[PDB]
Amino acid sequence: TSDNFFENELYSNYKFQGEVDQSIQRLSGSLQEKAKKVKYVPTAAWLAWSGATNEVARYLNEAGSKTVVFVLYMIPTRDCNAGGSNGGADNLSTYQGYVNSIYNTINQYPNSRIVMIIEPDTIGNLVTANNANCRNVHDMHKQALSYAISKFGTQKNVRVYLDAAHGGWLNSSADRTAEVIAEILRNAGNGKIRGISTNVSNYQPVYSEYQYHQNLNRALESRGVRGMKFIVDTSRNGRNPSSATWCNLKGAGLGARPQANPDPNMPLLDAYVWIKTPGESDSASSADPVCRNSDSLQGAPAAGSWFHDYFVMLLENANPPF
Numbered sequence: 001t002s003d004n005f006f007e008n009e010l011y012s013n014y015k016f017q018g019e020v021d022q023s024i025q026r027l028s029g030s031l032q033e034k035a036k037k038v039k040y041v042p043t044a045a046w047l048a049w050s051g052a053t054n055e056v057a058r059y060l061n062e063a064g065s066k067t068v069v070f071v072l073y074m075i076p077t078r079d080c081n082a083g084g085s086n087g088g089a090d091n092l093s094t095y096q097g098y099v100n101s102i103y104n105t106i107n108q109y110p111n112s113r114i115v116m117i118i119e120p121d122t123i124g125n126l127v128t129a130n131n132a133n134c135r136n137v138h139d140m141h142k143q144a145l146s147y148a149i150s151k152f153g154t155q156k157n158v159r160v161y162l163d164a165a166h167g168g169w170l171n172s173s174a175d176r177t178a179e180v181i182a183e184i185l186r187n188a189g190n191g192k193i194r195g196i197s198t199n200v201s202n203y204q205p206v207y208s209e210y211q212y213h214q215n216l217n218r219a220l221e222s223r224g225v226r227g228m229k230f231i232v233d234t235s236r237n238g239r240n241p242s243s244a245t246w247c248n249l250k251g252a253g254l255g256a257r258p259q260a261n262p263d264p265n266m267p268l269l270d271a272y273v274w275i276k277t278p279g280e281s282d283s284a285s286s287a288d289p290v291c292r293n294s295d296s297l298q299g300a301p302a303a304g305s306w307f308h309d310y311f312v313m314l315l316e317n318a319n320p321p322f
């Protein structure tokens with residue numbers, strides 16, 4: 001009954017399979033052969049819109065005894081800035097609805113092994129985003145995360161990883177980050193986390209990320225939070241990033257294939273995980289000025305949509321190579 005669910009065989013899902021299939025059909029020869037090998041590489045399934053509560057059962061039926069990795073990404077506000085919406089809940093109580101629904105479905109599957117990653121980019125924003133008129137959403141996000149952990153944090157067939165940004169974002173604020181994490185966990189009832197996920201939807205090298213894990217791990221320890229393990233998103237971190245551009249970064253490459261316990265010199269690290277879907281657009285180029293940076297790839301479809309050209313770039317730039 002090992003507490004590292006990645007030591008089990010990992011579940012490859014029909015959605016990513018279908019996404020790679022679209023690319024396979026537009027490719028020939030060498031790159032097609034490569035794409036065919038990427039198709040069965042386990043990737044996390046994102047719960048990122050209100051309908052996603054209906055998606056959970058299918059995943060769980062098709063997975064059998066294989067580890068399923070879910071990314072809960074359905075919090076109410078994503079930016080405490082003007083003109084932002086379309087992915088989050090009306091409010092806390094709408095959110096608690098989604099959490100209960102997912103929690104309930106999960107309960108019907110006592111033999112499944114489920115990894116739940118709490119919302120990506122929430123802690124990051126709580127530490128670094130400004131506090132003048134964003135006081136309200138701030139406090140609600142903290143409640144949101146505490147609630148999610150209070151539910152999923154008690155299910156035996158679940159292992160929770162709270163997301164905590166990446167080194168490029170929070171390494172110089174490990175003390176404040178631990179402060180926020182420690183308060184959330186204080187309001188999370190009897191919910192326990194297995195650890196922290198980093199580098200979700202980002203390109204940071206495993207080397208620097210593990211350095212971030214160490215500093216953050218220490219901050220949490222000096223706060224009373226002990227025994228934290230880590231997972232790192234290796235989906236797009238094969239090549240060091242040219243800049244801090246987060247949106248559809250040019251020159252990125254598929255990183256290490258998902259694996260449990262990948263390095264005995266990294267004893268804090270549970271696994272390399274493909275958490276962001278390699279090939280899915282970060283955002284439409286039109287959507288955010290940052291998507292128009294010199295080192296963001298252009299012609300990006302909307303967030304979540306297959307971006308064929310990007311996938312190809314990722315394939316070519318893969319590290320370790322084929």
Ligand SMILES: OC[C@H]1O[C@@H](O[C@H]2[C@H](O)[C@@H](O)[C@H](O)O[C@@H]2CO)[C@H](O)[C@@H](O)[C@@H]1O
Pocket residue numbers: 121128165166168169170199200201202244246
């Ligand atoms: O990591 C993906 C995440 O990036 C967010 O921008 C971050 C950026 O990743 C980080 O390098 C920099 O230090 O901070 C900014 C935020 O100020 C982006 O806002 C998210 O949409 C994205 O998921």
